[PDB]
Fold Histone H2B type 1-J.
Amino acid sequence: KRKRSRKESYSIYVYKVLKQVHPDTGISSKAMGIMNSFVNDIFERIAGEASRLAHYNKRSTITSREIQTAVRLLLPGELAKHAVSEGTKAVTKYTSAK
DNA sequence: CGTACGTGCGTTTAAGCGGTGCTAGAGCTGTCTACGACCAATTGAGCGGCCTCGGCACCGGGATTGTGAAAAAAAAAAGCTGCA
Ligand SMILES: [Ca+2]
Ligand SMILES: [Ca+2]
Ligand SMILES: [Ca+2]
Ligand SMILES: [Cl-]
């Protein structure tokens, strides 16, 4: 024993995004806990529906297109437009880096 | 207390029905290869742990903000009649 086991989180990232969006504001541990719950919630919803989609169409593979269709299903209007936008942009940029 | 909405009637409308003809496209098969799993070697990003100091929570004691009472006033209204 002697050292507690490692429990992953999105904290470093939530913080990274925080400095982008507001360089001089911090975040309490409870607030960070809510953010981590948030990310995990949504991960699970999007992956979940992506999972159904693939299975509903007899595909073994969850691709970027299943994420997109799921994102359209789970987010409301404006949020989904921008979400699909950022998702599209990111995959683009990522294939350019090769 | 006033009328909206239920009831019942005569007239009008088009749903449903049974059928026929045409064709998009659902869904299957066979081929072929790009891509994702799986691997072993490599290494850097993120883990837990720990220290510092700055943000925020307290606290007190001063200023603004609404509420309720009481009063004035206004203003109505109520009770009652003159006079035409
Ligand atoms: Ca086809
Ligand atoms: Ca392919
Ligand atoms: Ca830490
Ligand atoms: Cl993909």
